[PDB]
Assembly symmetry: C3
Homo-oligomer: 314 residues x 3
């Protein structure tokens, strides 16, 4: 039976800190003109299949680059390429028998689990309705660098403020922060709250950690930002535009709610002009571009762990 990566919920706190340290390490070596021994030709002769249900160029760029550093071949199968004209069972058994890994994006989560259930090779979740494991790893890599033993990244007592809609990215970030002893506070409009199944996974993630990260739920943005070390948002039709009125991240929101003097900004891209101001996006406060690049380093770490080390994280 192969081990899959569907959500941060599948990782112990130790396993998660290790993926992040590895990405940090590989990044420092490769950006100064060297190759890690563990990675050289680790995937040569081998194919990784990328299955995408809707366009996702950004995700493609980093998976593609990560596979190639390991000397493997990335295979793109988009929405014009591939459960419509053939059962989901069949597609799953057949493709997995001629590749070494599947990186997959689909719509509903029920879809990805069924695929993994019958795959004979490790499946990694590129993005689904409720999870986004690769993004969390990138985001914590970024946090770890900017604020620079085995079961921790030394981040205990930090505060993250999320302002906007409750979605896939927040869900996994929340689960990670809890394991790392980081406090999270979430501001959303009435009707756009964290689903209670997600609150259940966050709570279960508390088990066995001596100082877990705490969860705060609010309707008022000025409340969330209080004493925040980092502020995060995300992309949000007619119904929505009126509802998110005061939810735009601005300089005036930080001072008014009382965030830390040196608060930093994060958004996982692409960015539209509704969620955040130009002044904020392009300030020295903004970790946006390093965060985007850390996708490359997070994919290398994850693929080494799940494909090469067949799931034994070290």
């Amino acid at each position: 039976t192969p081990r899959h990566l569907l959500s941060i919920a599948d990782l112990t706190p130790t396993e998660f800190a290790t993926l992040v340290r590895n990405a940090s390490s590989y990044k420092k070596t490769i950006k100064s003109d060297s190759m890690p021994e563990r990675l050289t030709g680790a995937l040569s002769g081998k194919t990784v299949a990328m299955m995408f249900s809707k366009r996702s160029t950004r995700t493609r760029v980093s998976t593609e680059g990560a596979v190639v550093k390991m000397g493997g071949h990335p295979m793109f199968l988009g929405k014009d390429d591939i459960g419509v004209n053939e059962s989901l069972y069949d597609t799953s058994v057949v493709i997995s028998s001629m590749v070494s890994c599947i990186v997959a994006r689909v719509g509903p989560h029920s879809d990805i689990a069924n695929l993994a259930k019958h795959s004979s090779v490790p499946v990694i979740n590129a993005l689904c309705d409720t999870f986004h494991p690769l993004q969390a790893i990138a985001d914590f890599l970024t946090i770890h660098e900017s604020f620079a033993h085995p079961s921790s990244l030394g981040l205990e007592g930090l505060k993250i403020a999320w302002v906007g809609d409750a979605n896939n990215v927040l869900f996994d970030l929340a689960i990670a922060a809890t394991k790392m002893g980081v406090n999270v506070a979430v501001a959303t409009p009435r009707g756009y709250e964290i689903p209670s199944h997600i609150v259940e996974l966050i709570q279960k993630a508390r088990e066995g950690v001596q100082s877990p990260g705490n969860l705060t739920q609010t309707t008022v943005p000025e409340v969330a930002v209080k004493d925040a070390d980092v502020i995060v948002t995300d992309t949000w039709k007619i119904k929505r535009l009126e509802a998110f009125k005061d939810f735009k991240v601005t300089s005036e929101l930080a001072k008014r709610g009382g965030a830390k003097e040196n608060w930093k900004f994060m958004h996982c891209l692409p960015r539209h002009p509704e969620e955040v101001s130009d002044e904020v996006f392009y300030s020295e406060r903004s970790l946006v571009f390093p965060e985007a690049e850390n996708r490359l380093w997070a994919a290398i770490s994850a693929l080494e762990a799940f494909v090469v080390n067949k799931g034994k994280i070290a």
Copy 2:
């Protein structure tokens, strides 16, 4: 002048058995964590062009994987990519001068021959109107494993029963079976028979073999299945659905017509629910998934033979 693979009609019985033994051999070595010396970096620095006229994801998956095991690069050029805005002559001379091989799928057979006629590198037929060489090699690999000197795979006296429409796949399978001393019987509705040009190639394939495979043509399914070791079908609008009434492969058809006690089932995928029953498809009788995977092993064998060994099969 380069040597092409357009049909099993181009192969001697010895050359065909050798391609099958090679695929079997390479499969056993690679699935137990080793590389054959003959294959390592055999295609490095080199590009193989894949030209597809209509979607064919399944074929792509195996060609892509096969090229990469040899350390080469597979280039996908689909129907939005490439004889409409430029003569067929020109396209053929130009592309072939910057690659080492073309794996091509087109509509009419007249199309593929004209391309090959002016290519300066070996062309392999991925699928056309009347032939499908790669499929036959896979199918005989499968048969050879399940029922486990140079001019034979030791299969003399076996029976294959084809029930359904007469198409490209059957044509090449028939030509192969004849060379291998395997008996084939074909049940089709009135109007959907083997074209007499095909019957002519089967008959010509008889020449020089001491015990050739025999051909049987019928309109009644219960007649074909008599004493059959294997039963095969394939995907089959308004006109057709009424015509194939009794043609659905079922448990009740095997017993009624008198097939062997341990008859096995084969279909080259994708499968729809009209040709065969769920009960049959998923039984221990069904070699469907191994048959699908044997495409990978058959491509490695064929590309080694035609591209690396420049057509000298050994």
Copy 3:
């Protein structure tokens, strides 16, 4: 700051002759079953991004092949893949941070410069509104072979005649010919002349060359072809077809205008039947197919120079 290749206008006469000699050299070695030491694994572990705004299969084929000879990975991002749903600044910073090079095709030239302005890796111009650097290198490689010290390819005093529309390809060819001491004469209909910004770059290219190539502008085709060593055209709706009446390259045009006895023909493909006659296109006068293949050799040279040698041409 990375060095880009946007136009032949960025190259000294020495740098241009060197790119051409290198392509010639690499071509001779590789076509006789050997690898140049400088090229082997030069790009391994590394990704090159290809960004295409409109279909351009021919360009893809040669870039793809060139990258692979160097052991790198080519990544195709077409018009369904990627400044619409995200600022041009953002796309530029993000993609360039996870690849080693961008080969790009866009519409307006203002577009490509802005991309390069913010890229952290070398950008090469695949084709834009006014330039086509890769084509010029191919064309001069071809000329250099057919008519077979450091600041010259030994072509002084040759004549090139362009008959047809004034476009991107002609512009760069003209700038190259000037640096190489080759004479160019241009026949176009009234309304379809070289833009005066281009005439300005040709004139600036004269500076510092002891025998620069001369420019001639005409409305009559029979005038241009006088004493020409080579004749070139290109693809040219309702308004246009009447205007180019006498502009079709023919046997009868050469004799009538008085071109050299052994004049040669060039067209960068694809060809339509309006610009040139079948008799001319397929004669022994036609360097069309070698010219098409020389794209492969020109890409290897250019990518070695700009990506591997980080812009120090040698």
